[PDB]
Design a protein around this nucleic acid. Structure first.
Length: 303
DNA sequence: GCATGCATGCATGCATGCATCAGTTGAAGACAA
């Protein structure tokens, strides 16, 4: 009853997405008309926008104005009537289950089986139980079992590493026996930071644009390994090998490295330093409500 | 006929290939019959 961490499937689901986005396109085409293939799905899904430290959202103010009824019954069924037929052609080539699937999604029903629910089979149902027991044991603070789970999981030739916070917290409350925590974190980062589609990202990703998980997690957690102090110039040397260098938040990680080094003219240059990266992190992002707090601290330093 | 496998295609940089101090030297304007 939880998301699976393996690449969803082969099967039907492609032909279903076919039917879906093909029909979508026929209706939206005739709709702009009246208002006046993996690739068809691709263009289709394509032309569309793809007191505390909140990445504040973009709120409503310069946005738009009001609309007034577009769509009576007699006029919707206009736009519906033709594309449904063109659909009657390749519907003739997809399978019965997907005839009825398209039929119902087109009546506006919504399925009550899931892609997981219907992908039957010895092996996957076993993985499903394995991963469940993982997520359960981790909820239970049963770090030992949990760990056993995780290990037998990743042993299996199907699981992609989308279960890393799995370890990153698991191996984290497991001081016991294994290289851990930062080990995993900076490992993830080093491996998946270069070149060396669906079924993806925010908490996994590749290069050229940003990479939540591994990056920021080791990138603060090492600074927490320096709250273990009271290391830094290392974290800021290899933090100081950008660029993605639009990673503004990592600009704030850098400025944090300088406020922690600051804790004689050396300490000056470290406070000068943090003063610089805070605004080069006015790049944009959006942190630290008043930087005048950071700066009141920097004046407690200036003493 | 339908499902598994894996090879073809497509697309962003990169790498191979192929074309694009000192001497004699003359020339120019002033000057005499």
């Amino acid at each position: 009853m939880f998301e699976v961490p393996i690449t969803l499937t082969n099967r039907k689901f492609a032909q279903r997405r076919k039917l879906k986005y093909q029909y979508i396109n026929y209706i939206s085409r005739r709709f702009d008309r009246i208002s006046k293939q993996q690739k068809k799905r691709r263009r289709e899904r394509h032309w569309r926008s793809v007191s505390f430290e909140i990445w504040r959202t973009v709120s409503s103010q310069n946005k738009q104005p009001i609309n007034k009824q577009k769509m009576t019954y007699h006029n919707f069924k206009k736009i519906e009537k033709i594309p449904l037929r063109k659909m009657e052609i390749p519907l003739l080539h997809c399978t019965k289950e997907n005839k009825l699937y398209f039929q119902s999604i087109s009546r506006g029903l919504e399925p009550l089986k899931t892609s997981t629910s219907e992908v039957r089979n010895y092996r996957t149902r076993h993985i499903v139980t394995l991963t469940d027991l993982l997520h359960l044991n981790v909820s239970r603070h049963n770090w030992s079992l949990a760990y056993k789970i995780f290990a037998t999981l990743i042993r299996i030739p199907g699981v992609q590493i989308k279960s890393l916070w799995g370890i990153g917290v698991e191996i984290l409350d497991n001081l016991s026996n294994s290289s851990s925590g930062l080990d995993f974190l900076q490992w993830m980062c080093q491996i998946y930071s270069s070149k060396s589609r669906s079924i993806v990202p925010p908490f996994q990703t590749g290069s050229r644009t940003h990479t939540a998980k591994f990056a920021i997690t080791y990138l603060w957690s090492s600074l927490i390994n320096c709250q273990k102090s009271m290391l830094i110039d290392k974290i800021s040397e290899w933090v100081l090998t950008p660029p993605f260098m639009e990673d503004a938040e990592v600009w704030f990680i850098y400025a944090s490295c300088h406020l922690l080094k600051a804790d004689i003219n050396q300490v000056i240059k470290h406070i000068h330093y943090v003063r610089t990266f805070l605004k080069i992190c006015l790049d944009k992002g959006g942190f630290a409500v008043p930087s005048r707090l950071i700066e009141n601290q920097l004046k407690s330093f200036e003493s």
